[model samples]
Target: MVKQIESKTAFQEALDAAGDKLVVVDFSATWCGPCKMIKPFFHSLSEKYSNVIFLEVDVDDCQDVASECEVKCMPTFQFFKKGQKVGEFSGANKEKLEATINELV
Candidate 1:
């Protein structure tokens, strides 16, 4: 299941628990149409890719975490491995998102 990051502590805890696994965090907002569109895809990927950890951060709810992640746009996807950021993209392109996961994992 895709975990919802509600605060900085939860974000840190999630990353710590992920260990060496791939972590994908989707930065989104309630009013973002593109974010809503990509929500299902993200959820599907989370279920499909058990080796990867999927997380969602509502920018409006977790503004501090969003700022820490340097998210400048809605639906920004950040990839991490071994607790370090490895890849990132801002958009709702399913092909690119899947390709990135395939390339990284």
Candidate 2:
């Protein structure tokens, strides 16, 4: 099941715990409008891709993940495959997100 992370340890541990699957990380902030716009897609991805692990880290709540990930944007989807980062996208549209997911999965 998908989970929310608040620390770098939890984030790293989750990545380490993943098997030969993809992890979609929704890096967002509570105050960002665009972040809210695409938040549903993260939930949708969780429901659609059972094999893919979904993780959400609020940049405002968890500064560590944002600092460690170097996320300066409001909403960013970082794709990790087998504990390694594969791709990332920062936008509020479904097309850009789906295109990236299609490339990875």
Candidate 3:
């Protein structure tokens, strides 16, 4: 499973600790169907991209982080390189996500 972030403090710590590596954060909701299905794919991605920090934040659990990340969609994949967000994409699909990651890292 992907690492679940439930607090703003931990969210900050993750970005800070990520150093120069790519950080992929999945802003998800517990009751979302997209989250249920795509999380496994996201978790598998963690193995493929070992150095990339994978974070999953449940919107219902930590609404503040979701708002800060500007996640209005069900599942938003935000890419962070260093302390800044390089790019992002929302929703769940297998091919597009991997291609995006491949192009980045």
Candidate 4:
């Protein structure tokens, strides 16, 4: 499922709960058009990938988390494994996102 992260504490909990599974964190903002455009694709992928944990963070609402993740873009995707960051990409390219997820998961 595409879970919305509301706070840094919950973000930490989600990371811990992920264990060794692939965790995909989507950092976005409410004002970004591309972010809104890609929301459905992100949710769809979450449904398709059972073993992957998909998370979404509104950068404006979760400033600390966004700053900590060093997110400078509207839609940045960070991939994690075993509670550690493994890879990431910025922008709303669904093909690239799917390809990366396929490569990692």
The C-alpha stretches of model 4 lying farther than 4 A from their native spots are none
Candidate 3 local lDDT, residue 11: 93
lDDT against the true structure, per candidate, is 0.93, 0.84, 0.86, 0.93
Clashing pairs in 2: none
Put down candidate 4 lDDT per residue, 1-105, tens digits, no spaces.
Answer: 799999999999999999889999999988899999999999999989998999999998899999998888879999998878888999999999999999998
Instruction: State the RMSD for candidate 1.
Output: 0.7
lDDT of 1: 0.93
Superposing all C-alpha atoms, what RMSD in Å does each candidate have to the true structure? 0.7, 1.3, 1.1, 0.7
For model 3, residues 23-51, the per-residue Cα lDDT tens digits are 88888887889878898899999988886
Candidate 2, superposed: residue stretches over 4 Å from native: none
In model 4, what is the error at residue 37, expressed in angstroms? Answer: 0.4
Model 4's alpha-carbon lDDT is 0.93
Give the C-alpha miss distance for residue 72 in model 2, angstroms: 1.6
Ranking by lDDT: 4, 1, 3, 2
TM-scores for the candidates: 0.97, 0.91, 0.94, 0.97
lDDT of 3 at 84: 91
